[model samples]
Target: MVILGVGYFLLGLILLYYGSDWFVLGSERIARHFNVSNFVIGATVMAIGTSLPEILTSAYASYMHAPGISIGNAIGSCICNIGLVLGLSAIISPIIVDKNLQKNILVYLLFVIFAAVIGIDGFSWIDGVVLLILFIIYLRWTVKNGSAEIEENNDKNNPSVVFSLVLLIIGLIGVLVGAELFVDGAKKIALALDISDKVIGFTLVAFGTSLPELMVSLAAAKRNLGGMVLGNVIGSNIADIGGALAVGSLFMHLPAENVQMAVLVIMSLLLYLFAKYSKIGRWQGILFLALYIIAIASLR
Candidate 1:
């Protein structure tokens, strides 16, 4: 099973990488067609595209009668998104925070707070409904806020609008299917290693699940799509919290772990502080990595 797990996990990673690329390509083309900024595309369409894996994975974990991993998956994905994904992107090329991103950052902060508040008493069906409600509002807000800085690229040379949607739909399906297999493989690896479910979820599963965001962000950065890198990470974090947790909660009760939540709060604070700066250098990126190391090391 462990050997099969390894193969399954690797296959999932490959699918995730390609799925993200396809999604980003389609999204970028669509953004150009609609005259939307790359940043907004990353925050809305690309973000959702990359986050589909985590959302579906968490929901599947909940369905399988393991909510602890689901909770850990949520918190761990946030930390990984902010620390690993954001940090590496900055190191590759410094990310400059503009007025538009700052507005989006504030909205992201609200999501963290909302997730923490509901988990305070341990998640219930009612809390799940509340989160789903917030998810709806978030989607509405993102659409309203996504259009800006009309790009100069001509979409006439690109795939038609319908083809773009086709790519997105196919990409989403691949990611969700890959996530399901990856999570199953993760459980097998965890059991084989004699690791606790929570630890496995936060460490192996979290990192594995985060590959989509990392790959997408790196691709965006390499293309010199400035804010898309940050947009992908920030947008995915919001979806993980708002969409993943809510969907998972509907399937299973996620009991609160105050310690992990506290760690999440601490990292969330540092992430916001670093993100507030105009330019972030590699040293700042290293600091984010250091904070993540300290956070996990402090855990056990």
Candidate 2:
């Protein structure tokens, strides 16, 4: 049974990985048809699409009454984006961030911390509404500003919009189905293993949410787009927490924790400090690996 469970989840992972790629590519293709800037696509469409796994997984976990699973999974992915994903990328090749854009993300980061603290007792329906409202406010502001600034160079001549839209819809279906499978399977694994859903969320589901960003960073590192990688990491982190969670909350309410709110807000700070300033030389990787080892071991 364990072997079977693992096998099925492995399959789900592959689907999730490739499905995410399709979804991203498809989104970009759609963007081209609509004359959307790659930067906008990256921040809004691609941002939201790549975060689909986190969104669906958390929603499913909430539905199963595994609120810890949902919350932990989202928070854990935020950590991985800034921690393992962004950290490793920088140490490998320093990701030079565009300070102009990144500085604003810091404010958004503070907002994430704020919402996390609001869930001190847990993210309830009312808190979810507030978070969504904050997200919408940000969206409105970004769109207004984005219209005046065009970042990427472009060609007016492009492929058919119909084709891109169709492809986008198909890709979305694949991602949607794949997300459902992964969430269901992950929930089952959590239950069958007698482990807290939170653990499953942090270790497995978190990795799942960050999967696309991981591959993108790896590719960017290979191509030596260090600045782009940093930009991607920064934006991705904000999206996972600010966008994905806000998007998820709009759909459904998850449970909450009342007192540990402040600590949870500090979670991302630990990740940010480690990634931003800490020169995590090679030795730090070993330590991080060891930490994960201990975490996994505790689960067993």
Candidate 3:
């Protein structure tokens, strides 16, 4: 049974990776077709594509009455995005923090604090609506400022809009199917092993859903696009808390575990300090990894 559970889990991750990849590709192409700026595409379209796995998986878990999984997945991915994704990217090549990226990180930290405050006694539907409203405001702010940071070079060989739309539909289906399978497999494993759903969701499930961000950030870092790496991580973290958690809360009340919330707050603050003070070097990456290890270990 455990073997079968692992199989489903692995298969689900594969689908999620490809699904999000295609989704980003299709959406990016469509954005280019419409002459959207690169910064806007990175902040909005790419962030949404990468975060779809978390948003869908958490919402499904919430609908299934698995609040632990739903809340854990949302918060865990935020930690992973800052600690694992950005940490590894900086380790490979030191990332020079951009001013715009710093602003986004501050915004993300504010959302984290907001989530913590509202979720003190579990998140209700009203809380979800409020979070969604804040997310909309953040999106508008991004759109308003994104034009100023645009790169002139657009991908000239974008696919046709019609084909891109088809890819979008297909990718959505893949993400939906993958989320279903992933949640089921995770639940089964948790039950069989006598493990808490929050543990599984926070550790394994979060890492799995965060793979898209990990891959994207690494690729951007390798190409010396430090700004892109920071932008991707910060943007996705915002979406995970405000977007994914908000949608999940609408389905069912989500309990805010103290330990998980504390770790999330700590990680966000650490990232803010790093972004604000200096470039994230390999040593800072090691510190992030060490902190992440301690955070996960304390969860046990």
TM-score winner: 1
Q: Residue-wise lDDT of candidate 1 within 58-136, one digit each (tens)?
A: 8999999988778778777888877777778778888778776777777777777767876897787678788777767
- Which lDDT values do the candidates have, in the order given? 0.74, 0.57, 0.74
lDDT for each residue of candidate 2 in 108-194, tens digit (9 for 90 to 100): 567777876676656666676677677666655544544444444454334465666666566556555555566557766776787
For residue 260, what is the lDDT in candidate 1? 72
Tens digits of per-residue lDDT for model 3 on 111-187?
Answer: 88888878888888889889888887887887776554344335344346679878766665565456556766776
Model 1 is weakest, by summed lDDT over 10 consecutive residues, at 149-158
| Model 2: worst 10 consecutive residues (lDDT sum) | 257-266
| TM-score per candidate | 0.80, 0.64, 0.74
**How many residue pairs clash in model 3?**
0
Ranking by lDDT: 1, 3, 2
What is the model-wide C-alpha lDDT for candidate 1?
Answer: 0.74
